[PDB]
Design a binder for this molecule. Structure first.
Ligand SMILES: NC(=O)c1ccc[n+]([C@@H]2O[C@H](COP(=O)([O-])OP(=O)(O)OC[C@H]3O[C@@H](n4cnc5c(N)ncnc54)[C@H](O)[C@@H]3O)[C@@H](O)[C@H]2O)c1
Ligand SMILES: NC(=O)c1ccc[n+]([C@@H]2O[C@H](COP(=O)([O-])OP(=O)(O)OC[C@H]3O[C@@H](n4cnc5c(N)ncnc54)[C@H](O)[C@@H]3O)[C@@H](O)[C@H]2O)c1
Ligand SMILES: [Mg+2]
Ligand SMILES: [Mg+2]
Lengths: 337, 334, 334, 334
């Protein structure tokens, strides 16, 4: 609990580097080994300088075998195959699989061998033989015997605590979700052939409102079984480089008022789910450690006839909120065995 | 040929002038703003979002010359003090944002003033509110002050009408993901109107903001009065917006029925598309609302349905197209 | 009427096609690109920076119907197997990138192929570089393959040439304040190219970057070889750029002389303006370069002068427009 | 502990306040602006470009509490009417933009007023204009009104001073690629100041604009008087800027010498770097100026040299860091 889990990161892209950054400020968790195929000098620079998350809090120098991050050495390997990483050499109990390739059960568990690691957390959905965990919503399902788990998506970690609070208090019949989302790496900087064939993600990301699909509301059942098949949604990608907001319009079993809804969210608040009545904007949530931040100023309960539509809304940094939730799950999972 | 005056040569005003060049039977002979003719002539010629002007503009003393024809410019702060009649001006496009009630808009009507006024915004409940090809039939021609509604109203109305006529609307909640506007601050600072969100850098944030378009839809479609509410998320595009509506309907429907209904309701004001477009693709369109079949949802859970419908609009040109159709028609029954 | 083939339907190819619709006496009868035609058709119809396609585009078997006329759209990987002569194609705009040398580009030349080729890339010593209305007099017509230079070269060249011809250039440094481009990451990440600056979010940063358009000006203006160097600052506009040249000249000058000289050098490729414009005003212009007299500076300190001289260009449509001109002309000689 | 007034709680005002929390012996006891406490308290807590406030801010009657300690807020439009003396205020940060001359700034000095004024801007040619760690030695403590110069002057001066000291400057032209600021319109509209370029949408354009910093360098470095001129290109980032200087020198140099000379001159105000950084990397820095060795060019052509040196600055936090340093020093010698 104050015990410091030694952590490996595989793939030092956006999620890896931010996971690293987050881990400096949540100790009782420590990265001793990074693995990635790109030039360590390219990697050091991108750890140091970050457009949206700011300059690194400290110092980063390239040394033989790794980095000195504020004095402390950290090993950087470039082993292509997960089977070939001697994690146990550097005390590494658990691995954050963040490449984007090794995202099934049988691929990720190649990290497990006598010189490898005990456990693995994947940064995508794993399917349905790999448990899916949003911290402080459904992390109770972990018994400790599991070899590989998933941290869900950025959108799922925002929606989950907000949806869970609606279910436990009032009961959700059905709901539709709209995420107003920062542009992401899967969009073209300028109009051009998207190698996925998506005609919308082919368009200039920082110059357009771009509608896009998302499976977060449809696959919410993996995290909250009571809402399986009850939620659907979509996204509007807009020109901010990070920071997002999720609106849920739902029909509930119980009658409610705005005040009841907000107070129920305030009472559900914890390290993962924040609360605020400050009329904030997206730039204010960049770098937060909440997985989701409910905003009471945007709540609506529309009673027309007997019938009620309820609008809820929660902010999230699709980068750092997600990262923070992932580090929370990576800590807890390593501390059961 | 009806002679039109524009009070407020801003985004809506300047673009109304641009459209009026292609409307035979309507002509602008007076502009009133707060600035010199050279500022206004420059801003007509060059437009960041809507492109270079189609023609010639040259500055003169007391006005400017658009393709040879002189148009008078004045900088009178007060509506009552504008001598519209001097220039032959019968109808005024009130496009400043400051005289958007019946009382205030009527100051334009006096001796040597104008006969009639079209507000480019909600004008309160005691002004008639016209979305062209939805409720422009309600005009007899004896009105002094009418409203052309808001931009978001002109998007939502034909879409919500189509849902009501075909299926019946129980209730509904609207989100408009909307371009930033001139009432937002370019960088964080004191908002004169007290808004803590519009005080923030408009091109660097997703900014929640309130909107009355759904709440006041009763003024355009009486049968929907009290049934719709909503809000906005202002985002970093300089123009171009989209309206999502989530609704419970009286009749059970499918995605295909809903889209076909919309296509059938299509006209000059209400577009239909199945192309998966983005906001830049609607900049400068002449529809007041462009329905997008690619974003329609119909979610059935335990026999109950939620219906999602989405229409694009250029908050600038889409509104302005509607405004000028409503002007053209209002002039011809005056 | 010159029948044209476009090998590579990326930003350039697509705009070349769009341009060619309006400068007729030049026509596109065959497009060849390995991308799914439905993606290509969609990108032709809708363009973020250059607006909607002027016309209609529908995907048909083997090609597109663009406003009535059918255009064949093949996906030949190899240049020697495109049967250009089956669609009357005289001249090929090589815009793929893969076939940028002479011997690669001239595989388009065979009995069932084309007669001539214009690469969009910079040639390899034995391929002539051509800015239209600057050095297109060097083309005798016997050449098989030529280059149309870069976007920046097409902006700089007519401005530098007028400096040389009127005054004489000793040396110079160039800075381009440039739209972000497709070789920049949308968000911070590892980049093919290795550039730690192009690895950064392009629409959220000022990003210094290297250019050789000044260093390679010798190829277009022999008198300026070795005399100009430069660099760029990529900034958050999706298209539109501006080129600043600070030069020592052989002759003493005034700001008025400099400006009237540029005005005298004006033509279809080199525009001249005295309006205080901004980048959005040059989006989609057909000039290769647009001299801005309002930014001219001549700083006399002691006996000595530094002359600052500035030009706008749509790094997209300006370069494209210059490339369709070169393409038209090179075809009409044989 | 000297007690300080801020007039204008804007970008510079609020960041100055922020920096003063960590400066022992300086303390803000009064803020004056044109709006209520809740607006100002909100804009302090939440900052788009500079992040959340480091502390607690709570609104009260007549002011707000910052980590417990109360700060009075008034809304007095005229400097002559502000009773600074009531709150112990001796020195005023004149940060509104509207009282930026010796004469206008002096209106804070009266019975019940303040003792001394620091303008957060150029204040004309009869006022001591200080760039900290370049010429703050000129302050004796008897001055009533001083200027902290402009953002761009605080960037340019240490770079130009090292060039003078080590090698001697003949003449020089400056281009600053600059963030947009609050004097630009968020969308195309009449600019109150009459500037036809600042009228344009600032987050959607490259906007040329004038700047007096280069010409006024004589106030800070007398030996460079009349030798420097420049201009700006305002571009779509909300903060962060960079200054390119092209100079002919008296001594011949190499790239290596030039960079070594900058690193020698390095201090708390003048940073030195060799990392290929971009504008977001300098947001929030405490350096007034940050030299970038990677962009140094020395071009030699026929014996003759043009030298290019480039320094970064957060027009917001870099200037403010410089301003508060000058404020801290001025207050100690008063
Ligand atoms: N831009 C949109 O998206 C949009 C859409 C629909 C409706 N509207 C409405 O249209 C109106 C104008 O909006 P806009 O976006 O064009 O704003 P804008 O700021 O571009 O235009 C306002 C213009 O009015 C001028 N002005 C202000 N006070 C004046 C006075 N007393 N006399 C004369 N001129 C004066 C200003 O100088 C400016 O040119 C508002 O009511 C707004 O709600 C705007
Ligand atoms: N922002 C920059 O990058 C920057 C850098 C260096 C210097 N400056 C200079 O600093 C000054 C302020 O710039 P800013 O960007 O902070 O502007 P800003 O618009 O953010 O702030 C101006 C503030 O002054 C207030 N104000 C206006 N008139 C007033 C009055 N009569 N009394 C009291 N308050 C009044 C406004 O409400 C606002 O809060 C200007 O002189 C500017 O040139 C700005
Ligand atoms: Mg007409
Ligand atoms: Mg203090």
């Amino acid at each position: 609990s104050h015990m410091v889990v030694k952590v490996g990161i595989n793939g030092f892209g956006r999620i890896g580097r931010l996971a690293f950054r987050r881990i400096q400020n949540v100790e009782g968790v420590e990265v001793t080994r990074i693995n990635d195929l790109t030039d360590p000098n390219m990697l050091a620079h991108l750890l140091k300088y970050d457009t949206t998350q700011g300059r690194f809090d400290g110092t980063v120098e390239v040394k033989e075998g790794g980095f000195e991050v504020n004095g402390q050495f950290v090993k950087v390997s470039a082993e292509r195959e997960p089977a070939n990483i001697d994690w146990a050499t550097d005390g590494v109990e658990i691995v954050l699989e963040a490449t984007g390739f090794f995202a099934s059960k049988e691929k990720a568990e190649q990290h497990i061998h006598e010189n490898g690691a005990k456990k693995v957390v994947i940064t995508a959905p794993g399917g349905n033989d790999v448990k899916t965990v949003v911290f402080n919503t459904n992390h109770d399902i972990l018994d400790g015997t599991e070899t590989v788990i998933s941290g869900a998506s950025c959108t799922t970690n925002c929606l989950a605590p907000m949806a869970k609070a609606l279910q436990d208090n009032f009961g959700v019949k059905q709901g539709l979700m709209t995420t107003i989302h920062a542009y992401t790496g899967d969009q073209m900087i300028l109009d051009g052939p998207h190698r996925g064939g998506d005609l919308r993600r082919a368009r200039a990301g920082a110059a357009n409102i771009v509608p896009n699909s998302t499976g977060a509301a449809k696959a919410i059942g993996l995290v909250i079984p009571e809402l399986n098949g009850k939620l659907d949604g979509a996204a509007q990608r807009v020109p901010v480089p990070t920071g997002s907001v999720t609106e849920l319009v739902a029909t509930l079993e119980k009658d409610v008022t705005v005040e009841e809804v907000n107070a129920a969210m305030k009472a559900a608040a914890n390290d993962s789910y924040g609360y605020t009545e400050d009329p904030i904007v997206s730039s204010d949530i960049v770098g937060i450690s909440y997985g989701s931040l409910f905003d009471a100023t945007q709540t609506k309960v529309q009673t027309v006839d007997g019938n009620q539509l309820v609008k809820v809304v929660s902010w999230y940094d699709n980068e750092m909120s997600y990262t923070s939730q992932l580090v929370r799950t990576l800590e807890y999972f390593a501390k059961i065995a």
